[PDB]
Amino acid sequence: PEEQRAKNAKTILENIQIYERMCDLFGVSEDDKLIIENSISIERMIRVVTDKKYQGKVFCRLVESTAGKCSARLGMALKPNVEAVLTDVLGNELDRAAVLGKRMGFTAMFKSNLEEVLYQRGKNQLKKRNSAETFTLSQGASLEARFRPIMEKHLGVGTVVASIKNILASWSPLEREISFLNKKLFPGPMRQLCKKFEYLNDQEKQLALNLMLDASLILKPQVTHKMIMPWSMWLAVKKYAEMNKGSPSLEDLAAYSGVRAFMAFNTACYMSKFTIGKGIVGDAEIMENGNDKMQILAMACFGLAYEDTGIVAAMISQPMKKRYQLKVGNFNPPEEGTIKGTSAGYFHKWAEFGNRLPFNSFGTGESKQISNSGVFAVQRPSTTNIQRLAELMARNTGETSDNFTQLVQKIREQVGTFADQKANLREFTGGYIYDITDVTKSNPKIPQLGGNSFFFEFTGSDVPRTGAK
Amino acid sequence: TPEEQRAKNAKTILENIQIYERMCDLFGVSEDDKLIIENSISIERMIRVVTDKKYQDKKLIANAGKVFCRLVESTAGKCSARLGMALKPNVEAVLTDVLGLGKRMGFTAMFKSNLEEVLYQRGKNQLKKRNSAETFTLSQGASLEARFRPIMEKHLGVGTVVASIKNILASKKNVRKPGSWSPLEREISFLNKKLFPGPMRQLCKKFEYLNDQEKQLALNLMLDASLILKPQVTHKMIMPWSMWLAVKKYAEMNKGSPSLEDLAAYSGVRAFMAFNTACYMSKFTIGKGIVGDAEIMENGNDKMQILAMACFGLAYEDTGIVAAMISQPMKKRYQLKVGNFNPPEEGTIKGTSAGYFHKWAEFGNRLPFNSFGTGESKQISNSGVFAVQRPSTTNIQRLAELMARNTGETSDNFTQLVQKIREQVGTFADQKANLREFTGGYIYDITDVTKSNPKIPQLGGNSFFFEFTGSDVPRT
Amino acid sequence: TPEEQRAKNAKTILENIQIYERMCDLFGVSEDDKLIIENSISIERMIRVVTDKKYQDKKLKNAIANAGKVFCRLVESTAGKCSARLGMALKPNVEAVLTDVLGAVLGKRMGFTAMFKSNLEEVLYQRKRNSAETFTLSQGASLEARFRPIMEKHLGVGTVVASIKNILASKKNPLEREISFLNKKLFPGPMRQLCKKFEYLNDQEKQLALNLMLDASLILKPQVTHKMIMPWSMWLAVKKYAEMNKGSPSLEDLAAYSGVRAFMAFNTACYMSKFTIGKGIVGDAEIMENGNDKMQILAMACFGLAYEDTGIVAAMISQPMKKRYQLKVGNFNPPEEGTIKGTSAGYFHKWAEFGNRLPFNSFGTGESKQISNSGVFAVQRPSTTNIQRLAELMARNTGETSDNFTQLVQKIREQVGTFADQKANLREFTGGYIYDITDVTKSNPKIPQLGGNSFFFEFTGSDVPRT
Amino acid sequence: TPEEQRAKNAKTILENIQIYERMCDLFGVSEDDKLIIENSISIERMIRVVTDKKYQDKKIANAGKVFCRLVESTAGKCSARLGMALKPNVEAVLTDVLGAVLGKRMGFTAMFKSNLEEVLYQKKRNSAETFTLSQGASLEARFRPIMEKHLGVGTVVASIKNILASWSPLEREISFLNKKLFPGPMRQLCKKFEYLNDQEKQLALNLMLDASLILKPQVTHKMIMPWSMWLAVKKYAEMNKGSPSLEDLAAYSGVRAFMAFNTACYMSKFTIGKGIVGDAEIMENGNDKMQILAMACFGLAYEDTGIVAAMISQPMKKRYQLKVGNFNPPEEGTIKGTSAGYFHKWAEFGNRLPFNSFGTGESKQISNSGVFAVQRPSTTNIQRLAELMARNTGETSDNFTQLVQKIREQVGTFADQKANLREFTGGYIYDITDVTKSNPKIPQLGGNSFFFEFTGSDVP
């Protein structure tokens, strides 16, 4: 754990170094290095120059500040100078064609998570392969081909299915992807069907994929969630910890999971700034709102676009607003704007990440007791956990001799059994929200939920041209 | 744009008004008698009968070149039946003068069909029904003459298309090809477009390969399934020609009130406004005799409910919906005291009720299990990030719907699809309590043209128009 | 026709009265003793034996020795005290009483008396071919073989299944008609398709078919005809009461086997009618019979209520409803020594119509073919579709003739399955109500307060010692 | 026979007391230290380890001696020591007392140990969630056929899975399993097990095992106490003029088994040492260990905690809220006396099938046949209708595929009906003073009924 945060602190400091120099290369001032927008541009720029299969002057649209006002600028640097900064900071490493698949894959994951909060899909045109309703399973879909194998665990079932669908139109790329899909998928006939993949027709592989994709909208898959912030926010931490002796050091807050990752976020919010200008997504005449933007930033850093809005409302220091109630723009440097600082104590509560199966078909960190064996001849109702028995039977009663048609029916009947149980179904049983002060998890709390939990919901309160359209 | 449509509709409405006015002159119908609903029903039907070549060629006598039309003749609030007459070419001359027709008569035939559906459970005084009695609610456009079936296809129910398929299957036991395709190929394509997605649509593809036994079971299964797995049928406000003439007169005689082009709509609030405006000057007949008992006097408010129900095709609609928008208490079929709407031997003239619709709605037209307008979304579930205990938020109905569209194989036999249809019924029936049609569909006040104040009606109770009550009029 | 029905019924009732009064005279039963239920039970049973041409032809074939005397155990009384007596008459006299009053037609007449006796026995005893748990489907199972064909519609699915099993067992040492009768009663669907295939089925398949159709009918309720079958003495108590109070409704006014007039004929018979109270009950020869307990069984036997929902019956009677083993009632046979107790008038304070069709269908003002709505307006609403009626519609309309035995068996299991899950929405006799006896014109319909155990044969802590 | 059995039990318990008292002399256990539960546990295990013929066949350098870990008290504080006796001296104790003869008594001795272990810790053959069906799992294969009835479906399935990984012992086990299983298609599949392929065999075992979590099996239960606790009953009875005799308390079922348990707690002892299960630094709690002991004696590890709570005169705590170590001799430790009247309520044992309660106050009426056309809901018992269809509509012609499908819908019907499912209908709780079941009582059942529930008030 301390051994972990020490390995984290090393890579974070090395990223602050890369970020500080690239800003110097592109003429970003010391105060402007703390504008979130500049980090989006700098990190993107690195990914573009690094993109070997895409392959000198380099251009970077950035923000320039003057008092409280801001303006966009076009920075310029030489391509050899850009590659020399990475080479000189990262010595005995960089052997990867994509600099470091982790390093840039994380910057690309933040960019993907922000895109998910800002748009249902609507940015990368409409190059969709899967149905519109399966987009909540499309975590990390904005990622480049390069970063998907290394950023696998963070990827959604929809993303992996889309990658397989694109492929269809020591190792094997197709086998590699179905393997990642197999690990993510809810245990049972869906995993059996993955093992039977490549034994299928081109017409059957499609049914296989689309079925497992649809089924996962109820039979939840396992996806890894980390706290991914822009580099300029890790700079704000490093700065605040050094400008404040008593406060927690960068090493203490150098985490991507647990309470330290939430403290890392709030301490970054002391010195971090964002831009505010005219125009929002789909309406150029509406002004950007500072509280609405802050929500989208906190959601982007945690990948909250598909999370239960009620869970989110419980940890947030501002009222939770649905997507089309927010007045927020591109996050790209505005032509003209104003500087707005970040909200210091945004996250009053914190929570652990649900990195494993939400229904917990194995009960790894749970009690294994699902029923009682009667000793006394005393009247009692049935005490058997119906959903855990359903989870166990699907996992346990798999027929290896089963045909594609046999497996297709078993998945449909797995969906039905859980859909008939709908009201009693519980995800992440045993998981609670804790206060920031509550480091030890000594005092658990219930989020107190009810009503629409969909972020991409259309409401009467929606902003003109959005959810109204 | 909606204005380009209203201008086009107002042109059709004005041609129809002229055809009507000219036909009334030829049959000696007084200026005031032109506004009697019954006269429109008789003139429209006459125009349909004369222009039907199949019936005119089979009719052949002097009487074959004659056109008899039972009309209402009123004195001073009191009316009487009269046999109007014109020669066949004089009827065809009026048509040649106003027009340079098929679709025009199809619409008139759709009002008569929707009036018949409200008036009768059977509708034709004939027990020769191809479908099971309980599937009568899927018989939109059943009374519609074979000629008008292709043009009005969209307005027809699954039961009307299935009984048309069954008709072809009975004759071809005991042939045409107009497109490109054959009448049966055309009919199964129409059913496939209406039918709820999933195995029912897949059984439509395999239909031409099915043997006469599998074919009949297929039809009945798709028909029974359609009673929960609601099909796609288009609806329009189709009112008589005399009612459009009563819209014309009122807009002319009253400045500031919307024009005929403003009210020229068969959809939205402007259709409700056109119906409500048409009722300022329209009239109908009240006589002795109702459907069932020949000695019961007709009720005015009861006849006004049927008229309203005929124009919007509300026979098979949820009574609680209709109740929330009409200006009288909603009565079930057999509580109503109304006659066949044909001109009576003797009766009294009654004016329609102005502002009969206090509330309005838009038409279904798409699959009812799908959502309506701007206000829904595409998000069906959540993807948990924080390990915090929460219930399943997945939309079971929307997921069931997505899986019906997305999970198609092509490699399923008759029997396999038959079980898949039955399971599809099972899945939705098991969901009854939380199953909802037209999610995002609201009721609006008549004055609320903007749709700024959406309202959900106070549902519950028996929804069926053809249910029996204690109040059921003696003999019915 | 409803008034014409009662006139035709009265003609039969008056003929039954004449047969009954003349038999009592032949058997030396006094005018006051003719109103005793136990004598009506004994006299009707007696006639069924004398008219049993199979037994009677065999009885003289076994015989000079042809002593054709008819013996009958009867109740004789001295006001409130009563005692058993053995009556006697000659077969030619018993036969002449039939011929003189009537004129083939006698079968239907005796078939009904035997039905009242099966209905009486279904109440008194809960108990050999079918499973014990399926006994609630064995109505008319005490009817002798000769009466089962006439009284077909009154027979339970278990009674018909028992007859089919009995034919199949004798064939292991006609059926076609029993199958047709079973087919009619059964809930439509794969159970009816399994009836059509039954002659092609092997002996193992045949046995599984009958057992499954029976088990399934315990939820997928069959059609059984019900009429109010009252003993002959009871109809005599109506005749006598009607000609006593001239203002009160006549016999013709109360000559009904169904509706409020049947319930009114019952309450009228109750003024003058009498039964016996003795020492000994069913299962316990030491316990004294209770009057209110015996009156409950009488009303139940007259309406065939043994298997009917307890809560429904409870809501219609003038006494607190008791489960079978809370009752102190013996045989309805003449006691050796006992007392005379008159029946309880106004026993039924509420009435209802008989449910002779499939329970899952609708009754009264709900018999309409409309079971769904076709959406015209884009207005948010729940689905209005009648799930049980739609499941019944698919059962009749669909179903493959290309179905094998195992295909049809798996389908029955699946049909029982859907309805077992549908149990929240499942309503039997929908649109049917309970009415105050005073309300003839079915106005002000009431709904019984149902909840708790509805099984008459349930075991409680109130259960009488030995039972 | 009820008091004739007590006579046969008294004879057997006394033989055990004689074997025990002699073994304790062989290993140098002081008269006071004989009444320590931990000493009865080690002595019993020693006799099983010495009577293990194959293990003795398995083994100058040969130490043909017996080694036993025992508790040595002194004052009130205690210690752990290693006792030794010559193997033929130990054998002579068994010959002096006994001349089935030994296997049955050591089987029950092993059965108490399995019950103790199941209350202490939550099997590699079966899935983890199926552990509540593994009664008698700890038993060595010598004891399994003898104690058959007492074994859980999980145990029997793991015995079959072991044979597969290599009458016959397989045929034996399948018929033992057939008797236990919920009646219907599971019992039919058991009959087909010989004709199933190895893949179908594994599916059948796991499906039968998983099903049993809802479709409850038939398992025999008895009151099993260490020999020292019966030595305590034998001591206490001879002391009080009012007190019932040992023969009067010689029961393994009914009220007398509870009165025997309580009478034993007046003179029996255990130890409070440093170290609990998992946390080698936490001090053991007396009342906590007393709950484990009562639960071990009655095999209550998997029983509904709410039932157990209503019967015991101390607050019911879930497994990880307990400060209890293994019942092995502790290095340091302090002698703690057992609690004199632990059970204030009692109940009879299950032993039969928990769902089908034949007779009791449950009649054959399962449904109603409507007469009047009155609106009402369906009154038909689904549970009972499902149960009847399993007896009446069995198809011998069914293959593996068809029987598996039927198991699944049998589970599905029961899962759907969970709200209306009741186990041991007409089964009640009674006061210890209520000897002839006159005033039945019902336990207040509401919360989580699982003993192995994690809780917030846990122990790290």
Numbering used by the authors:
A (entry chain A): 9 to 63, 81 to 194, 215 to 514
B (entry chain D): 8 to 67, 77 to 116, 125 to 198, 206 to 210, 215 to 511
C (entry chain C): 8 to 70, 77 to 116, 123 to 146, 153 to 198, 218 to 511
D (entry chain B): 8 to 66, 77 to 116, 123 to 145, 152 to 195, 216 to 509
Show passages lifted from the paper.
All these results suggested it was a new genus of the Orthomyxoviridae, temporarily named C/swine/Oklahoma/1334/2011 (C/swine/OK) and then Influenza D virus (IDV).
Full length D/NP was crystallized in sodium malonate as small fine needles that diffract X-rays up to 2.4 Å resolution. The structure was solved by molecular replacement using a starting model of the monomer of the A/NP R416A mutant. The molecular replacement using the tetrameric B/NP model did not give any acceptable solutions. Several internal loops were missing and the C-terminal 50 residues were disordered. The loop was then stabilized by several kind of contacts; mainly hydrophobic (by the side chain of the strictly conserved Phe-421 and Val-423) and of several aromatic residues lying in the pocket of the neighbouring monomer but also the salt bridge between an arginine from one monomer (Arg-425) interacting with a glutamate of the neighbour (Glu-352). The sequence analysis of D/NP showed no import signals in its N-terminal part but suggested the presence of a bipartite NLS within D/NPTAIL (514KRR-X14-KKRGR535).
